[PDB]
């Protein structure tokens, strides 16, 4: 009933990302995804947002939410790359020893599992059978990653429309 209204908007913005990879989203456009009474598992279907937040929630929120948002900012770019009309050269390969990754994403519990959602299944890299990334899935994960980074930033600045429910994590 009301979960459908969320999914429609969720899909409509996912489609937007597939058309334009560098498409930017305001808080005005993200509104129906932010002000929905749904729980976390019903709003993040691919991303395990609950585990990403609570398993890195040690210390001060002003510090772990920024470490978390920093990782989500890179993960979103990992997605936008696969969606670009021309994809980067070494797109199918992600090395742990890589500077940007280990310094950012691999500093967060569950950062790797997000890449597996993108398509990097064989252990990270794409399987040989996969010659090109799934345009629908990536855009969906990228949207959820972007959505989570957005929610955390509204948490850090105490403006989230459901701030008095998310702080239970």
């Amino acid at each position: 009933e009301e979960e459908r209204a969320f999914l429609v908007a969720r899909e409509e913005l996912a489609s937007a990302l597939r058309r334009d990879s560098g498409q930017a989203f305001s808080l005005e456009q993200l509104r129906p995804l932010l002000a929905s009474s749904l729980p976390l598992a019903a709003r993040y279907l691919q991303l395990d947002a609950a585990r990403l937040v609570r398993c890195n929630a040690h210390g001060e929120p002003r510090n772990y939410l920024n470490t978390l948002s920093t990782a989500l900012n890179i993960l979103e770019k990992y997605g936008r790359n696969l969606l670009s009309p021309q994809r980067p050269r070494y797109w199918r390969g992600v090395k742990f020893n890589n500077p940007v990754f280990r310094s950012t994403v691999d500093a967060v519990q569950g950062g790797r599992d997000v890449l597996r959602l993108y398509g990097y299944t064989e252990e990270l890299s794409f399987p040989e059978g996969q010659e090109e990334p799934d345009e629908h899935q990536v855009a969906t994960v990228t949207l959820e990653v972007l959505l989570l980074r957005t929610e955390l930033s509204l948490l850090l600045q105490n403006t989230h429309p459901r701030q008095q429910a998310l702080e239970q994590l």
Binding site: I74, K77, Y78, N81, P88, R89, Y90, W91, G93, V94, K95, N98, P99, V100, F101
Partner: peptide, 4 residues
């Protein structure tokens, strides 16, 4: 950068 992000792949190396």
């Amino acid at each position: 950068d992000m792949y190396r």
